[PDB]
């Protein structure tokens, strides 16, 4: 189930959130498939971090991205995992 996901709209939505929608809607629809499933929701967030790690070449941009990423389930109307390592 995890291998099948298209999290590119989440990566697009987050980096535009850092610069300062079509992708916020599409991102929440993708994340909705993991609602109230903590292990699988965490892997989705981790895979967004994994793909974006090379592109965050600065402490302040990295922390804002992490912060916005931790708030992404809540801002989509979903529960975040109790624990999810983003390092």
């Amino acid at each position: 189930q995890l291998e099948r996901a298209n999290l590119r709209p989440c990566e697009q939505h987050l980096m535009q959130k850092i610069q300062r929608s079509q992708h916020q809607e599409r991102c929440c629809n993708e994340l909705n498939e993991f609602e109230n499933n903590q292990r699988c929701m965490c892997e989705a967030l981790q895979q967004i971090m994994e793909n974006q790690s090379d592109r965050l070449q600065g402490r302040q941009q990295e922390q804002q991205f992490k912060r916005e990423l931790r708030n992404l389930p809540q801002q989509c109307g979903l529960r975040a995992p109790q624990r999810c390592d983003l390092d």
Partner: antibody
Amino acid sequence: QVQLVQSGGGLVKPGGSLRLSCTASGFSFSDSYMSWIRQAPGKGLEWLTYISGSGEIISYADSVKGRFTISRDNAKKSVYLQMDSLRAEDTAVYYCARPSDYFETSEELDWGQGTLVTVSS
Amino acid sequence: EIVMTQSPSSLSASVGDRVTITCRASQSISTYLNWYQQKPGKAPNLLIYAASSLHSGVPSRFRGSGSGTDFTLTITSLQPDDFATYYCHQSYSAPRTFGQGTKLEIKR
């Protein structure tokens, strides 16, 4: 290395007010929720309130809504609990708690030493 | 408030026994159920989070199971350090709520 150092509390008359404070180190305070939990003498744990890192999300248990106020100062790495209109029921040990991670669902993990609050005339 | 209903309220058992504490939630709380141990005068210690996951350092004899409304903490072989009070705890939705607690005493 996580440290939670509480302060305040003590003896107070019914209807009076106390401000409990808790200062935290060893983690990213500004990203973490913080919560207050109490335990009256010989009774069970009673969850009271929490506050998001920004301070924009706040929740109060029904037993305390309208009487207590939680706040935080991220620059001071501190979380506060203003208790007003106290009652004899409120006599308890009050615990500061930090959750295990930086989400709104993260469960309490590290606890302060506890502060005894006694409400009596 | 999500009401958490623990059973039993008290329990006597001997070293080596298999103990079971249950926690029933007022509504579906998914897997967002946590278990704490508290000894007198001390702050609670987290045993289990996410209804099945052991916190680092917690011995393997503690095991959690369940999803939805009904949850269980199991102690496969009770040890001398296990006599304490045990609480369930939901972080599914705020305000969070503890169960009433379960005091685990020595049988004789």
